[PDB]
Amino acid sequence: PARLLIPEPRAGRARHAACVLLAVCFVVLFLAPIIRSVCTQLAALQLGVLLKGCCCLAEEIFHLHSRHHLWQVLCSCFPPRWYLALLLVGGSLTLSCLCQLLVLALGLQKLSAVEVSELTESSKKNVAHGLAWSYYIGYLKVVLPRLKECMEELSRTHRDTWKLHILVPLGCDIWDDLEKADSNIQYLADLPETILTRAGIKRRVYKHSLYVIRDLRPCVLEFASPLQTLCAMSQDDCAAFSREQRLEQARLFYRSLRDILGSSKECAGLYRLIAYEEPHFLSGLILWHLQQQQ
């Protein structure tokens, strides 16, 4: 199997390194008269933060009813601990205000790549987590409990392997015809369908397929579909989206899906996530996962 390097979540040791550098710099400040001097700089920052809120009253007043329907807007305007800044302003000029305005005009407070990356993958509001929730709720929550009955119905036409391997290709190749993927992968038949009236559509139909892979074992197998969506979210270039970020979002999607099916409760063992990169081959990986459980 190929080496799976998916990124871990952020541990948050940067604050620890900042604290250590703070303590070391205080020790070198060792080897009372200057503490007031600290305040002469400190509220100098906390003015400008307030200034940012003042400018954020600018556009938000054009969004009163359409986004916020007064006190809600000013509640949303500045960071929530606003009284510390005024508390520090009271404990004491135009140069500071003009410097903060000269910063805020030219826009030199642009965050870097790693900061927006941690802000993206920290919140659960990016593309990959929402799309993984869509794939979990819309498909996997519904089909997977009805898998064993259709398997038994085809059985009247190996109980360890009655699962649903989801191929998750961390990359670009997504194929509709898996018989073009290898000469070893062969189509045999399909499962009995599933009929559900979902979201106004009456009798929506979910299907499957059964693939026999030999040298001599059957399995159910399909691709994780919405990666295909990402495959058109950068090729068509109508979304601001790059290939390196495409690989990043695919790894994030596999990580989020692994997390969701980790704490899943209905999906007992019926799923089996197979993920890979491009280093024939795919049948060899399928056979390795298939023999691994036995």
Ligand X SMILES: Nc1nc(=O)c2ncn([C@@H]3O[C@@H]4COP(=O)(O)O[C@H]5[C@@H](O)[C@H](n6cnc7c(N)ncnc76)O[C@@H]5COP(=O)(O)O[C@@H]3[C@@H]4O)c2[nH]1
**What distance in Å separates the CA atoms of residue 259 and residue 247, rounded to the nearest whole number?**
18
* One of 104, 142, 267, 273 touching a copy of itself (CB under 8 A): 104
Q: How many residues touch ligand X (CB under 6 A)?
A: 12
What are the Cα distances from residue 21, in Å, to 16, 26, 31, 36, 112?
Answer: 9, 8, 16, 22, 22
Of residues 185 through 244, those in contact with a copy of itself by CB under 8 A are 187, 190, 197-205, 207-209, 221-223, 225-226, 228-229, 232-233, 238-241
Does the annotation flag 254 for ligand binding?
A: no
**Residue 69: CB minimum distance to a copy of itself, A:** 9
Euclidean distance between the first and the last CA atom of the chain, given in angstroms as a whole number: 17
Does the annotation flag 139 for ligand binding?
A: yes
Structure tokens at 241: 């989206």
Residue nearest to ligand X as judged by C-beta position: 138
Of residues 42 through 81, those in contact with a copy of itself by CB under 8 A are 42, 44-46, 49, 53-56, 58-60, 62-63, 65-67, 76-81
What are the Cα distances from residue 22, in Å, to 25, 33, 38, 39, 41?
Answer: 5, 19, 14, 17, 17
Chosen from ligand X, a copy of itself, none, partner binding at 139 (C-beta under 5 to 8 Å by type) = ligand X
What are the Cα distances from residue 108, in Å, to 42, 79, 94, 135, 182?
Answer: 20, 20, 20, 40, 53
Of the candidates 149, 147, 135, which has an alpha carbon nearest to the alpha carbon of residue 230?
A: 135
Contacts of 240 (CB under 8 A, 6+ apart): none
Of residues 159 through 178, those in contact with ligand X by CB under 6 A are none
Q: Does 183 bind a copy of itself (CB under 8 A)?
A: no
Of residues 185 through 214, those in contact with ligand X by CB under 6 A are 199, 201, 204, 206
Of the candidates 8, 78, 95, 4, which has an alpha carbon nearest to the alpha carbon of residue 44?
A: 95
Smaller CB distance to ligand X: residue 1 or 138?
A: 138
**What distance in Å separates the CA atoms of residue 74 and residue 239, rounded to the nearest whole number?**
33
Of residues 218 through 277, those in contact with ligand X by CB under 6 A are 222, 225-226, 229
Q: Contact residues for ligand X (CB under 6 A)?
A: 134-135, 138-139, 199, 201, 204, 206, 222, 225-226, 229
Binding site members for 3',3'-c-di-GMP: 134, 139, 204-207, 225
